[PDB]
Amino acid sequence: SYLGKVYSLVKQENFDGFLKSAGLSDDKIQALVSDKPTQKMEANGDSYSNTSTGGGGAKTVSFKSGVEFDDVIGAGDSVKSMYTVDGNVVTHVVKGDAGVATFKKEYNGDDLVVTITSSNWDGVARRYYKA
Ligand SMILES: CCCCCCCCCCCCCCCC(=O)O
């Protein structure tokens, strides 16, 4: 049901904490926390496409479930990303110089909840989006 819908950020918790654990610069942290991103996912048979707007601009990237690839996320951070698509749960594992982070995306109707964990901190961050 989530395919083709645009989800917009409505609220977030502990996101600043998570970014600190990532060792990002203060200006990047400020820009990310102030962003009001949107995201739309599409299925293309063999691959999926994710279109995002906000900080770091507008982009559409394609990927296959289970395959790692070189990527750039956030405000220009270089990482190795790997997404696993399993029904209504999309898990994005990212490996960067700072460590590893997991972004668990759960879709339920018009709501999308993203739970984020990091290898450098014990807190849990949440991003709530609505279509
Ligand atoms: C320990 C982290 C290593 C990788 C570095 C990650 C840098 C963080 C910037 C990522 C923001 C991505 C937005 C979260 C995803 C979502 O909201 O759906």
What's a quick, concise take on this entry?
Binds fatty acids in a 1:1 molar ratio. This protein has a single domain, classed as Lipocalin (Beta Barrel). By secondary structure, the chain is mainly β.
Highlighted features:
10-stranded antiparallel β-sheet, Lipocalin, mainly beta, insect fatty acid binding protein, globular, binds palmitic acid, 59% strand, binding protein, monomeric, 131 residues
Overview of the molecule:
By secondary structure, this protein is mostly beta strands. The chain has one domain (1-131): Beta Barrel (Lipocalin). The protein is 12% helix and 59% strand. Strands 4-3-2-1-10-9-8-7-6-5 form a 10-stranded antiparallel β-sheet. A hairpin with a 2-residue loop joins strand 8 and strand 9 (111-118). The longest helix is centred in the first third of the chain and has 9 residues, at 26-34. The relative contact order is 0.23. Palmitic acid is lined by residues 22, 73-74, 77, 79, 94, 96, 98-101, 103, 105, 114, 118-120, 127. The PDB classes it as binding protein.
